[PDB]
Amino acid sequence: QIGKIIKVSGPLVMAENMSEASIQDMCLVGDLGVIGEIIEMRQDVASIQVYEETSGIGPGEPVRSTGEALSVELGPGIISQMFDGIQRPLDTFMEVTQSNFLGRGVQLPALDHEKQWWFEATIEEGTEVSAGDIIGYVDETKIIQHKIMVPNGIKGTVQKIESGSFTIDDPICVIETEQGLKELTMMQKWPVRRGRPIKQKLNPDVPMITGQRVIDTFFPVTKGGAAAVPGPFGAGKTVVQHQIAKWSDVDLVVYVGCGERGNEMTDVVNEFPELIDPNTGESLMERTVLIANTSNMPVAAREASIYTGITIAEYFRDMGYDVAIMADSTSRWAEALREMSGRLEEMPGDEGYPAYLGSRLAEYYERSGRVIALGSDQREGSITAISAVSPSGGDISEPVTQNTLRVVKVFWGLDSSLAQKRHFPSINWIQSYSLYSTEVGRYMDQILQQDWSDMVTEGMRILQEEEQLNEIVRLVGIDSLSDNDRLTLEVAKSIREDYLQQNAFDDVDTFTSREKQFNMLKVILTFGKEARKALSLGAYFNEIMEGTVAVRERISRSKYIPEEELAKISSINEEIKETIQLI
Amino acid sequence: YRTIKEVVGPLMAVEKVSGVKYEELIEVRMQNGEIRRGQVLEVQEDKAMVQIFEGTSGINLKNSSVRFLGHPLQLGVSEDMIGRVFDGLGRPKDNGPEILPEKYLDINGEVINPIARDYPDEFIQTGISAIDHLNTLVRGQKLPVFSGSGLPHKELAAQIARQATVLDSSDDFAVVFAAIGITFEEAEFFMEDFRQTGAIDRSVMFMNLANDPAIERIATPRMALTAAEYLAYEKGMHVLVIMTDMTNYAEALREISAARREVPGRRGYPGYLYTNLATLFERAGRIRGLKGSVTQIPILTMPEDDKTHPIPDLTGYITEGQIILTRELYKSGIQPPIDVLPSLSRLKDKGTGAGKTREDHAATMNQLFAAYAQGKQAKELAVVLGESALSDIDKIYAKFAERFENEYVNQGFYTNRTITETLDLGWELLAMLPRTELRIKDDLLDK
Amino acid sequence: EYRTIKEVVGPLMAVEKVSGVKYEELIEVRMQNGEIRRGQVLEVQEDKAMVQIFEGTSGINLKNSSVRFLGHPLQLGVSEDMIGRVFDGLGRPKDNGPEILPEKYLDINGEVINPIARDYPDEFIQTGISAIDHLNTLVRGQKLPVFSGSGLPHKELAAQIARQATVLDSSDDFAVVFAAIGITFEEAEFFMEDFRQTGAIDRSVMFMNLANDPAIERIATPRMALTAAEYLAYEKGMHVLVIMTDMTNYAEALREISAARREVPGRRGYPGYLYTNLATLFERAGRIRGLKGSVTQIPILTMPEDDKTHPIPDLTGYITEGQIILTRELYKSGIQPPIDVLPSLSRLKDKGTGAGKTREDHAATMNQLFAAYAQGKQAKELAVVLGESALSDIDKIYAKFAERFENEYVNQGFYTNRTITETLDLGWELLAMLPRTELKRIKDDLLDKYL
What we know:
The structure is cut from a larger assembly and holds one copy of chain A and two copies of chain B.
Chain A: E1 3-9, E2 12-16, E3 25-29, E4 34-42, E5 45-50, E6 62-69, E7 71-74, E8 82-83, H1 90-96, E9 117-121, E10 128-130, E11 134-138, E12 146-149, E13 155-161, E14 164-166, E15 173-176, E16 181-184, E17 188-191, E18 200-202, H2 213-218, E19 226-230, H3 238-247, E20 252-258, H4 262-271, E21 288-293, H5 302-318, E22 322-328, H6 330-343, H7 357-365, E23 369-372, E24 380-389, H8 399-404, E25 410-411, H9 416-419, E26 433-434, H10 437-448, H11 452-473, H12 483-500, H13 514-535, H14 541-547, H15 573-579
Parallel strand pairs in A: 8-21, 19-24, 19-25, 20-21, 20-22, 22-24
Antiparallel strand pairs in A: 1-2, 1-6, 2-5, 3-4, 3-6, 4-5, 7-17, 9-11, 9-14, 10-13, 11-12, 13-15, 15-16, 18-23, 23-24, 25-26
Chain B: E1 4-8, E2 11-14, E3 25-29, E4 35-44, E5 47-52, E6 65-68, E7 74-77, E8 84-87, E9 103-106, E10 117-118, E11 124-125, H1 129-132, E12 145-147, H2 153-163, E13 165-166, E14 174-182, H3 184-197, E15 203-209, H4 214-234, E16 238-244, H5 246-259, H6 273-281, E17 285-287, E18 293-301, H7 310-318, E19 321-325, H8 327-331, E20 338-345, H9 348-351, H10 361-380, H11 395-409, H12 419-430
Helix pairs in contact in B: 4-5, 10-11, 10-12, 11-12
PDB class: hydrolase
Keywords: Enterococcus hirae, Rotary motor, ATP Binding
Entry title: Crystal structure of nucleotide-free A3B3 complex from Enterococcus hirae V-ATPase [eA3B3]
């Protein structure tokens, strides 16, 4: 069936004689053969949303269905690649097109179909298998096992199977099904608009070890949980998503650049191959998938990248891994939904965005979480959604943030006067929250045999006391302020400048171990509590501050402590009990 | 019918049909053999507009077909529903028995004759001091909770559901719980709490998630209320209906409305929103000559915490008061974070007193309210004056207000307070204040 | 040639009975009176064609006119011979100079640089202005905008960076592309004289679009300029600096076309696609793997009411790599240019600093002169009505620091060229205020350099 363009109006194209096709079918449009998706059909006439610029195309030109919805190839040679919105790998692109530029019409398999991979078989002939059962694996990286699973929709027994070297096109397994014989490869396709099936969702109850002090301590995210990072321009989001991406105790990172800067995407493929995880000792790229749809790339393919990312994240989830997905920025995706809706003449919602915005965001954030994957083994996996949001004027009351915040439990708000006044990372310790705090409390205090949540409560309480005393300095003045309350500021001073503040380009302050965090906070918590005991005994606030300057601000440099052996700041506690017997 | 002519978004045009009714259910037989359900939104001459629940992807028009089922959304009711979980169409979600229904009812219901309703009479112990004492829930009342994103309405909801009891000789409340467009996390909280406490053996659950089709969202409350009226008005049960989150119901409304190409009224929402809402919340109360009853506690998040937003505004015109959670309270670790001053129950009057509660209910309630008002005023005026405007006679209210929030209101989501304990605490609190603060002869009786 | 114009509605025309017409193709109307007018195809359908006429449709008689479809979109004729020539918003010759027989015709939309092929902005550009070169450094391939206001000396500064911009090799492989967007004849002539007067014209290519030129040609101007910039950078190996003013004018035009096409207004009157649109301009700046030469961007915009959160500076900010902010509190006095360093950011400062690019001392002295000024700007701000005038021996030399910081160092005048050495040289004698110990850091690996 040859279709024929009857109308080209922006990214929107209309073609007659399209009746053999289906809604959501991908098709090649015009003489250029540009990528498009069918979104409506009236009689034989398809309305097509084109994922490339339509300039120079017009009525009379041909249109062919691919007879397949927007999909991703899923198999080995995925890890470490950089794809575009629709999963074209950018380096092969360069090579096939002999060009430094995105040309229209180019058609690429996502994965290298020619690469020989070693298949190690793991299931013996004669086993009953269904969707999600691992039949073998491949050492795709040094660390990561690419585990090869039966595709969804397959059921039966393993007829033949053997370890060996193959391509992703070669049949490695034979299954006798209900219909008959079916041969599988190391590669499967999945339609990105459809969450990959699972046994059941679980409650995400284990904290992410990001190592970023402020996050893990006061606004933790669980494995399976979801965080939002909304903020203005020059907030530093980017120099933060990196930190998440590098340190989180996950297995794979999917880092999706939806409609942001091109340069930032380069910085990633520059700096990620240099970012070596100690122990494993191999580059961060070796555990990262990049999808890039830059701000000047086709708008319609912005929504493509978001789905591409998360579907890939689902695949590795299904193998029993923990994945982290970074979508940046999710504002540009909604902006692409606004544009299409206008073109389709739909009834607008708030600020022009479509009325099905909330649903979309919901459909996305719910594809994330902790699951029991399919398969007899009943293995368990997770995806952790971290999303940057970029509201107009940094104003959060905006629809994309509000719809996101009603489906996510973690809010890392980026202020302007923090970044502008050198407070990294720029996180609003008042406005921000994690509705996981409570449960992470139970988890830690019990993992440490400690009262860490009681400590967490006390710190936040001190930052929320300081908040109203600062709007009280804005009155009579700092001079007339009482002893016990003067102390409250200088403990908060400590927390702000020492705990919360973190350097991304430092050799040691880029990451903080879980127990290194525990000591630091306790080192702060005894200081505040014991200086309180000096006030209630008749020693003025002034006497205490002049009383310790070096040893009190040995805690200022204590964020820079390394780890030759494990014990480091396991010293200052019995050393404060010294000056409380002296001063 | 092999006659699909248009597919636009999740909408289908079907031609040459006849006998087709508005809101009638349909099934799509897709070309791969797959079946999707839908509903007629529009019907003119020999054509019909349908929306498809599971969206419209994959369909080839020419080779699909539609069946018309001859009946709209119905609920297959039976007493066997107690102790079960369904999605927002009434389909089982607990892998238990397929329930053999007694009959199938239209989920729209019917409007209660205004002269058939009975005045709500009986006090409901929720076991939450701030409601029970200061804003009393009464059997047959509609009393909602207005909250915001992040705020623990979820916790408050589960607590009311575990604890709610009447002081009578029964029966126990049957709980009909409708989750509407909530995250799997929210929902998984509820279903574990109910399983943990055994509150499920007393409940009927309708679970509809955020990634569920917006029409199903729309159906969810109508399904739950159909269940509730059946249990109450046909089986003589006292039913307590809790619904979160109505904001979600509303958001779903705009979505369908946009799809039907309607024209929005105040603040983006539909003209008919009011009627829609009343349509839900008036399915409640006692009926003359009937043993059972339906009491509603709708729960909703206020967009941008805006009281005047249509959602909270219209709800207020329809329901008999409301309970507000504030951020100022929540952040201050107060649980449940109920602000009493803007909170109101309209039916509290006849619900309380001697033989309902205790002889002193009204009295303490007004005084605690007035005192708290003065204490907030003392704290608010501690911005400029800071201290010294309350050297003796006014100091106490500030202290009072603080402790009222810390001891009385903040009680914990797992603490169940009998009305005895609530009232008692309130005096043990009022005692801080000098007696020149007016109680009656009874100021010396409960002292 | 089609004598089949069906409909004229304002600037918009419908042609039917056509065939082979493509979206965004150029057209020419041949009016009954012999006049020729160019336009473009906005929409195409069946045998119909919806077009916009750049000069509008006043005077047209439908029945006796005709449309020619040219078989191409908006293009630029390119050649090495552009340098030292003046063009309008569409690249039509403006200076009455020689006939241009071009090499190849290029579509002004260009093509997106593959993220993989892109090279990170790198290497220093000598501007001649301290407060930028030492504190918010211009790396090659950077988009570093200048925000401003009306009546501020953004104009005066623009042409300076044209004269005084160069690389540390030679100015022969360095070329300026100057684009004026929607400006007054007088502002235009200000740029004509300063360029012709200082000879800096013969390293520049100029695109001059005026306030009274048609809106569509305002829109086309930056893409004309950037097409020439991409050409000379990547086809000819030059380091190309692109100065565009005023981007606020660009935005109003875009908004005027939007409303003319009956489109739905987005935030504060402006199109929902303002972001993406700007992005398609600012992203043309950069470097590429393998190929020599770059495209650097300095867009100038005037902020309406000086509101940071306005769609114009707001969306500029989310796309560009930093910002140069001009305040009026500094412009009140002779301070030129009045650049407040506090909100000024160059997100790519390190990539244009250090040994062999500028100096061994650059990085440290930047964050030194910066952190101390934060305490000074506040000290001088602390009035005698709060108050008061009793700040200690700490803030009798800190407020004396922030005061001398503007009047002498930043206040450098609109015609003084400060070679990177000069600027760094002035940083030392200027920081000779306190004694050594008040400056952190660091000490012993230094501790003097220099010193």
